[PDB]
Amino acid sequence: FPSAVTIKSWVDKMQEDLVTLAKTASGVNQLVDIYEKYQDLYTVEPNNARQLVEIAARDIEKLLSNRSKALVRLALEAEKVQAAHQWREDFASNEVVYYNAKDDEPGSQRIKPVFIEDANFGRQISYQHAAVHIPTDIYEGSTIVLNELNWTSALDEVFKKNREEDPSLLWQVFGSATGLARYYPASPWVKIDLYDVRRRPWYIQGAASPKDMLILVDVSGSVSGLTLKLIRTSVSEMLETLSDDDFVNVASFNSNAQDVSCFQHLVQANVRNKKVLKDAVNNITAKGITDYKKGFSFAFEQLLNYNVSRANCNKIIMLFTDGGEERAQEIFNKYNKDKKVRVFTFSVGQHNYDRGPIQWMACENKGYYYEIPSIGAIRINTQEYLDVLGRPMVLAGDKAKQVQWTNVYLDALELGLVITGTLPVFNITGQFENKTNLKNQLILGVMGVDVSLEDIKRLTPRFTLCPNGYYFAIDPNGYVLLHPNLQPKPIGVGIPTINSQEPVTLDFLDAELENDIKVEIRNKMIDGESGEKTFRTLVKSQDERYIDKGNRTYTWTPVNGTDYSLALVLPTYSFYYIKAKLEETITQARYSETLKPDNFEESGYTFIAPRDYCNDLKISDNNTEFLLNFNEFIDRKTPNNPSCNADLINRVLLDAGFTNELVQNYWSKQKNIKGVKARFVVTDGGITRVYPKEAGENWQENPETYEDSFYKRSLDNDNYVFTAPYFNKSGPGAYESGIMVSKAVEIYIQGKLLKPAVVGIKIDVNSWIENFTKRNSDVMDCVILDDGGFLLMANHDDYTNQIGRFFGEIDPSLMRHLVNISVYAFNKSYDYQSVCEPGAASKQSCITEQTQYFFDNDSKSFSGVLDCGNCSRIFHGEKLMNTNLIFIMVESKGTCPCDTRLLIQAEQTSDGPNPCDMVKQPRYRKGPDVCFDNNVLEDYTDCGGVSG
Ligand X SMILES: *[C@@H]1O[C@H](CO)[C@@H](O[C@@H]2O[C@H](CO)[C@@H](O[C@@H]3O[C@H](CO)[C@@H](O)[C@H](O)[C@H]3NC(C)=O)[C@H](O)[C@H]2NC(C)=O)[C@H](O)[C@H]1NC(C)=O
Ligand Y SMILES: *[C@@H]1O[C@H](CO)[C@@H](O[C@@H]2O[C@H](CO)[C@@H](O)[C@H](O)[C@H]2NC(C)=O)[C@H](O)[C@H]1NC(C)=O
Ligand Z SMILES: *[C@@H]1O[C@H](CO)[C@@H](O[C@@H]2O[C@H](CO)[C@@H](O[C@@H]3O[C@H](CO)[C@@H](O[C@@H]4O[C@H](CO)[C@@H](O)[C@H](O)[C@H]4NC(C)=O)[C@H](O)[C@H]3NC(C)=O)[C@H](O)[C@H]2NC(C)=O)[C@H](O)[C@H]1NC(C)=O
Residues that bind ligand Y (CB under 6 A): 54, 57-58, 307, 514-515, 538, 557, 560, 825, 827
Closest to ligand Z by CB, 614 or 946: 946
Residue 574: count of CB within 10 angstroms of its CB: 23
Position 66 contacts ligand NAG (CB under 6 A): yes
The residue length of the chain stands at 948
Look at residues 157, 152, 94 and name the one whose alpha carbon lies nearest to residue 129: 157
Residue 791 near residue 724 (C-beta atoms within 8 A): yes
Q: Which does 166 bind (CB under 5 to 8 A by kind): ligand NAG, Ca ion, ligand X, none?
A: ligand NAG
Q: Which of 178, 220, 382, 795 binds Ca ion (CB under 5 A)?
A: 220
Measured distance CA(401)–CA(422) in Å, rounded: 9
Site residue total, ligand X (CB under 6 A): 6
Q: Which does 154 bind (CB under 5 to 8 A by kind): ligand NAG, ligand Z, ligand X, none?
A: ligand X
Residues in contact with ligand X, shown as a per-residue x/- string from 78 to 117 under the rule CB under 6 A: ---x------------x-----------------------
Closest to Ca ion by CB, 258 or 665: 258
Closest to ligand Y by CB, 538 or 871: 538
Q: For CA atoms 53, 54, 56, 61, give the dihedral sign.
A: positive
Least distance in angstroms from the C-beta of 239 to ligand Y: 25
Measured distance CA(690)–CA(519) in Å, rounded: 42
Crossing angle of the two packed helices 155-165 and 49-84, in degrees rounded to 10: 160
Is 220 annotated in a binding site? The answer is: yes
Measured distance CA(870)–CA(569) in Å, rounded: 52
Q: For CA atoms 857, 860, 865, 869, give the dihedral sign.
A: positive
Least distance in angstroms from the C-beta of 519 to ligand Y: 10
Least distance in angstroms from the C-beta of 120 to Ca ion: 57
Closest to ligand Z by CB, 89 or 621: 89
Look at residues 912, 769, 755 and name the one whose alpha carbon lies nearest to residue 831: 912
Closest to ligand Y by CB, 512 or 781: 512
Least distance in angstroms from the C-beta of 100 to ligand Z: 19
Look at residues 662, 656, 576 and name the one whose alpha carbon lies nearest to residue 32: 662
Measured distance CA(159)–CA(710) in Å, rounded: 48
Q: Which of 63, 81, 495, 582 binds ligand NAG (CB under 6 A)?
A: 63
3-state helix, strand, coil in the chain (%, to 5): 30, 25, 45
Q: Which of 82, 172, 187, 222 binds Ca ion (CB under 5 A)?
A: 222
Pairing of strands 780-786, 885-891: antiparallel
Least distance in angstroms from the C-beta of 345 to ligand Y: 27
Half-sphere exposure of 595 (CA within 13 A, CB side): 32
Position 176 contacts ligand X (CB under 6 A): no
Least distance in angstroms from the C-beta of 390 to ligand X: 24
Least distance in angstroms from the C-beta of 92 to ligand X: 12
Amino acid, single-letter form, for residue 296:
F
Residue span binding Ca ion (CB under 5 A) among the ranges 180-188, 216-224, 415-423, 544-552? 216-224
- Cis geometry, peptide bond prior to residue 915 (ω within 30 degrees of 0): no
Q: Closest CB to ligand Z belongs to which residue?
A: 427
Is 218 annotated in a binding site? The answer is: yes
Residue 532 near residue 570 (C-beta atoms within 8 A): no
Closest to ligand X by CB, 151 or 824: 151
Closest to ligand X by CB, 83 or 262: 83
Residue 192 near residue 140 (C-beta atoms within 8 A): no
Residue span binding ligand NAG (CB under 6 A) among the ranges 58-66, 117-125, 539-547, 713-721? 58-66
Position 86 contacts ligand NAG (CB under 6 A): no
Position 165 contacts ligand NAG (CB under 6 A): yes
Cα–Cα–Cα angle for 431, 433, 435, nearest 5°?
80
Measured distance CA(807)–CA(781) in Å, rounded: 13
Residue span binding ligand NAG (CB under 6 A) among the ranges 62-70, 101-109, 501-509, 513-521? 62-70
Residue 188 near residue 124 (C-beta atoms within 8 A): yes
Residue 529's contacts (CB-CB under 8 Å, 6 or more residues apart) are: 556, 558
Specify the DSSP class assigned to residue 271: H
Closest to ligand X by CB, 147 or 553: 147
Look at residues 198, 183, 299, 208 and name the one whose alpha carbon lies nearest to residue 240: 198
Least distance in angstroms from the C-beta of 141 to ligand X: 15
Half-sphere exposure of 241 (CA within 13 A, CB side): 28
Closest to ligand Y by CB, 108 or 827: 827
Position 560 contacts ligand NAG (CB under 6 A): no
Q: Closest CB to ligand Y belongs to which residue?
A: 825
Look at residues 559, 750, 541 and name the one whose alpha carbon lies nearest to residue 42: 750
Is 222 annotated in a binding site? The answer is: yes
Q: Which does 871 bind (CB under 5 to 8 A by kind): ligand Y, ligand X, Ca ion, none?
A: none
Closest to ligand NAG by CB, 62 or 457: 62
Site residue total, ligand NAG (CB under 6 A): 8
Least distance in angstroms from the C-beta of 151 to Ca ion: 47
Residues in contact with ligand X, shown as a per-residue x/- string from 123 to 162 under the rule CB under 6 A: ---------------------------xx-xx--------
Q: Which does 562 bind (CB under 5 to 8 A by kind): Ca ion, ligand X, ligand NAG, none?
A: none
Residues in contact with ligand X, shown as a per-residue x/- string from 276 to 315 under the rule CB under 6 A: ----------------------------------------
Crossing angle of the two packed helices 271-281 and 226-238, in degrees rounded to 10: 170
Query: Across the beta sheet with 908-910, what order do the strands follow?
Result: 824-836, 844-855, 908-910
Closest to ligand NAG by CB, 62 or 618: 62
Footprint of ligand Z on this chain (CB under 6 A)?
87, 89, 427, 429-430, 436, 438-440, 444
Measured distance CA(754)–CA(662) in Å, rounded: 18
What's 163-182 look like in SS3? HHHCCCCCCEEEEECCCCEE
Closest to ligand X by CB, 176 or 441: 176
Least distance in angstroms from the C-beta of 367 to Ca ion: 21
Site residue total, Ca ion (CB under 5 A): 3
Helix (H) or strand (E) holding 226: helix 226-238
Half-sphere exposure of 933 (CA within 13 A, CB side): 20
Closest to ligand NAG by CB, 337 or 729: 729
Q: Which does 222 bind (CB under 5 to 8 A by kind): ligand NAG, Ca ion, ligand Z, none?
A: Ca ion
Pairing of strands 417-426, 409-410: antiparallel
Closest to ligand NAG by CB, 451 or 609: 451
Q: Which does 427 bind (CB under 5 to 8 A by kind): ligand NAG, Ca ion, ligand Z, none?
A: ligand Z
Half-sphere exposure of 357 (CA within 13 A, CB side): 15
Residue span binding ligand NAG (CB under 6 A) among the ranges 56-64, 190-198, 503-511, 709-717? 56-64
Measured distance CA(260)–CA(215) in Å, rounded: 10
Least distance in angstroms from the C-beta of 517 to ligand X: 58
Interface residues toward ligand X, by CB under 6 A: 81, 94, 150-151, 153-154
Binding-site sequence positions for a divalent metal cation? 218, 220, 222
Binding-site sequence positions? 218, 220, 222
Interface residues toward ligand NAG, by CB under 6 A: 59, 62-63, 66, 165-166, 728-729
Interface residues toward Ca ion, by CB under 5 A: 220, 222, 290
